């Protein structure tokens, strides 16, 4: 029944597409084909609810700011992807969260922090530093591999769950009403 708008964001090459395609098509894309923008639809059942997932897969780097602003306005939930062997991509997470909060003019935006490529031996970003970042934001953290598929379903489902909690909150939130 319910429709969720998920936006996958992150630096160049972190595996945004591979994750999405693992979720949708159940196979690992070995090729590196830079994204402009891709729109996907998946129907899953989560906690006994049929969810229509509208997933936007975004570019590592947008040439026009206005194109970034557009998906930051529309997205209900954001999957914030870094690669565990890419320190810069991890540092970029802060900037994505800030721009999203600016654009939403809001402190509460459902997000999940995703550390991808956990199958690699080339780690430069420690689980702990990533856990601590998520804890600071008040969001879930999940490590994944689009190659092995570890954590993939979980990352997306958790995001859906975060959106639900925010809707629940939003209703009762927070000083200007609100219900229950
Ligand atoms: N070992 C490993 N490789 C991965 C993983 N995810 C993606 N890759 C590889 O990294 C490269 C980039 O993957 P891709 O999913 O296209 O990244 P992207 O962030 O979507 C690229 P863009 O930002 O240009 O859209 C590909 O060669 C892909 O096979 C992973 O979990 N583990
Ligand atoms: C054009 C556009 N804007 C979006 C914003 C979100 Cl949050 C999710 C999606 Cl799937 C889209 C699409 C693709 C529509 N086919
Ligand atoms: Mg891509
Ligand atoms: Mg990007």
Swiss-Prot record:
Residues holding GTP: 10-18, 29-35, 59-60, 116-119
Full protein name: GTPase KRas
Family the entry assigns: Belongs to the small GTPase superfamily. Ras family.
InterPro entries: P-loop_NTPase (IPR027417), Small_GTP-bd (IPR005225), Small_GTPase (IPR001806), Small_GTPase_Ras-type (IPR020849)
Species of provenance: Homo sapiens
GO BP annotations, alphabetical order: actin cytoskeleton organization; cardiac muscle cell proliferation; cytokine-mediated signaling pathway; epithelial tube branching involved in lung morphogenesis; female pregnancy; forebrain astrocyte development; gene expression; glial cell proliferation
Outcome reported for the amino acid change (mutating residue 146 to T): In OES; somatic mutation; also found in colorectal cancer samples
Entry membrane topology: Lipid-anchor
CC per GO annotation: cytoplasm; cytoplasmic side of plasma membrane; cytosol; endoplasmic reticulum membrane; focal adhesion; Golgi membrane; membrane; mitochondrial outer membrane
Main location: membrane
Documented activity regulation: Alternates between an inactive form bound to GDP and an active form bound to GTP. Activated by a guanine nucleotide-exchange factor (GEF) and inactivated by a GTPase-activating protein (GAP). Interaction with SOS1 promotes exchange of bound GDP to GTP.
Self-association and partners: Interacts with PHLPP. Interacts (active GTP-bound form preferentially) with RGS14. Interacts (when farnesylated) with PDE6D; this promotes dissociation from the cell membrane. Interacts with SOS1. Interacts (when farnesylated) with GPR31. Interacts with RAP1GDS1. Interacts (active GTP-bound form) with both SHOC2 and PP1c (all isoforms) to form a tertiary complex; SHOC2 and PP1c preferably bind M-Ras/MRAS, but they also bind K-Ras/KRAS, N-Ras/NRAS and H-Ras/HRAS. Interacts (GTP-bound form) with MAPKAP1/SIN1; inhibiting K-Ras/KRAS activity.
Compartment(s): Cell membrane; Endomembrane system; Cytoplasm, Cytosol
Alphabetical list of PROSITE patterns matching this protein: RAS (PS51421)
GO terms of molecular function: G protein activity; GDP binding; GMP binding; GTP binding; GTPase activity; identical protein binding; LRR domain binding; protein-containing complex binding
Reactions the enzyme catalyzes: GTP + H2O = GDP + phosphate + H(+)
Post-translational modification N6-acetyllysine, affected residues: 104
Result when mutating residue 5 to N: In GASC; found also in a patient with Costello syndrome; exhibits only minor alterations in its in vitro biochemical behavior compared to wild-type protein
Result of changing residue 146 to V: In OES; somatic mutation
Reported disease: Leukemia, acute myelogenous: A subtype of acute leukemia, a cancer of the white blood cells. AML is a malignant disease of bone marrow characterized by maturational arrest of hematopoietic precursors at an early stage of development. Clonal expansion of myeloid blasts occurs in bone marrow, blood, and other tissue. Myelogenous leukemias develop from changes in cells that normally produce neutrophils, basophils, eosinophils and monocytes. Leukemia, juvenile myelomonocytic: An aggressive pediatric myelodysplastic syndrome/myeloproliferative disorder characterized by malignant transformation in the hematopoietic stem cell compartment with proliferation of differentiated progeny. Patients have splenomegaly, enlarged lymph nodes, rashes, and hemorrhages.
Resulting phenotype, residue 34 to L: In NS3; characterized by a defective GTPase-activating protein sensitivity and a strongly reduced interaction with effectors
Protein EC: 3.6.5.2
